[PDB]
Amino acid sequence: EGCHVDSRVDHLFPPSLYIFVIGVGLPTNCLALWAAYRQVQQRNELGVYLMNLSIADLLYICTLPLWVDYFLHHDNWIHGPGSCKLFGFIFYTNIYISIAFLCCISVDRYLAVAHPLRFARLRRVKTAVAVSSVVWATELGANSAPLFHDELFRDRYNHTFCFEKFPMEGWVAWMNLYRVFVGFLFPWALMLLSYRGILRAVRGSVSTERQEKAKIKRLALSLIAIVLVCFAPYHVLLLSRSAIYLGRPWDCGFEERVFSAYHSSLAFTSLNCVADPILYCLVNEGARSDVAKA
Template sequence: MNSSQGAMLTCNISYDQGTVPLITVYSLVLAIGAPANFVTLCLSLVKICRKNVLSVYLFTLSLSDLLYMGTIPQWILYVKNHNKWTQSDTACQLTGFIFFNNLYISILLLCCISTDRCLVVLYPIESQWRRRRRTAVMVCIGVWLLVMMVHLPVFFLSSVKSAKEKNDSCFETIPMPPLVAKFNYARFSVGFCIPLFILALTNLLIFRRIQASPCLNIREKTKVKYLAIAIILIFLGCFAPYHLVLLSRAIAFSLYKDSCWFEEKIYNASTLFLCLCTINSAINPILYMFSCESVRQEFCREVQSIRNHSSRRSNRTDSYILRNGQTSGTSVYRMEHIASEN
């Protein structure tokens, strides 16, 4: 997104530094995150059909991450071209809109997941009757709509200048427009601090209850402890640096009429920290799905089931050929179709 409020780009920003690290991180996130989120999407869909409430949030989280993964090639090309946007302004706005929607949808859904886990641990009997898939679906829809409605004014109603008037850049709010500065204060407080408090509180309550439970052994309690620590540390590592930069840029804009000197010093760190936010999209499936032993076992059962099904279908086809001689391609297709139905 480009600068608004009629401000011309006067800051002397170098776009040549950090190109290789950014492209490397984006490429790794795409290579790891896309298949991991696709598998998580499928597994969570299976568990939703089995009336698992938590999987509704995991499914929505993976769906949002996959949608963002589709925009990563655009960001890689943009960084490779030294921040020269070669497509339309609308494509720039839409790509940025998808990215920041995913960023805060992910943050809010992580809060929903931790809250849901906390309710199950603290109130196992009550939550069994009160937790409903329909409620989880409505919460997910509400999160999507809320985040989209908050970002719409910034991305599409803020008199954003043409990218061609801004040296073909995209998503570079330098110098920072007043609307974006105010928005950054809200993003830091509501989009980062409050979710961080929710994550810390819910995981602390989960940890305390598990530690006091006589039904779990030391190994299981240790696993819960490290999972809670990992959730908080990953959240801080992925989101804290970028939001601290947002806050510092907003403060500099508020204190100085010309904040270009600060923008020039912090720009490289800002782009790197923005890239770090995307790592969360690749970590989420590993943290919430594949780290769970029951999920890994279910995944292995599903894969084994597919293999067994394929093996039975192949054996039935071979048996039919041995009994009736070589068949045509159409006959083999029909036999495979019959075998799959059985």
């Protein structure tokens, strides 16, 4: 019935790093939200996107402690079906909404910098809220597929998972493939493309000194690379797990081998929630200045 998964580091480090993320990101996420409010006061379209990214991060942080508890009990959910179906749906889908908002920020910056005298109607708070609501609704609707299924799967090895039956199901495999591809790689690719275009425009500027170009390049490379560092192990492991499940559903040794790596990858993916604020608001001089004023 159930795969014989076993771990020796999942019960220890993922809870610790979740606790660290909860401790540090929430103040930084609140600061980012306040900075986004201040920007949207000044008719800044980027303020809406930063707002939405921050609030998605707060949702993830607030849903984290239950999953810390779940990982501490060696993969046991002791808080009921509905609580699982809600908090484990907020816990997932939130990295994907955050990725989509990062893509929106990148596209907005590219339109503003590469084409500074055109697309006036897209760079508006009304268009910002329209696009933000559209992406919120579409992400919720597209990732609410698990909500129609019962998620309390129990093996014979004293495990009780909220999500992710480790014997693995067909629908969860397809949904994981859709996440790993559409919700991660496509918007990250758009973020990369937007920041490449931004770097091209910055190198093409005349009023920009060489030092400012180097700073801009370093910041953009940080923006591109942080998401990959945080997210690539998790989605690589998901792709591999779903792939071998498609090849051999009865296969169980690889699940046991990669259980620890999979939980470690989830823990690492949780780091982008704190990476986004300290690198989209705190790093910049003006946003840090207004935060200090606050």
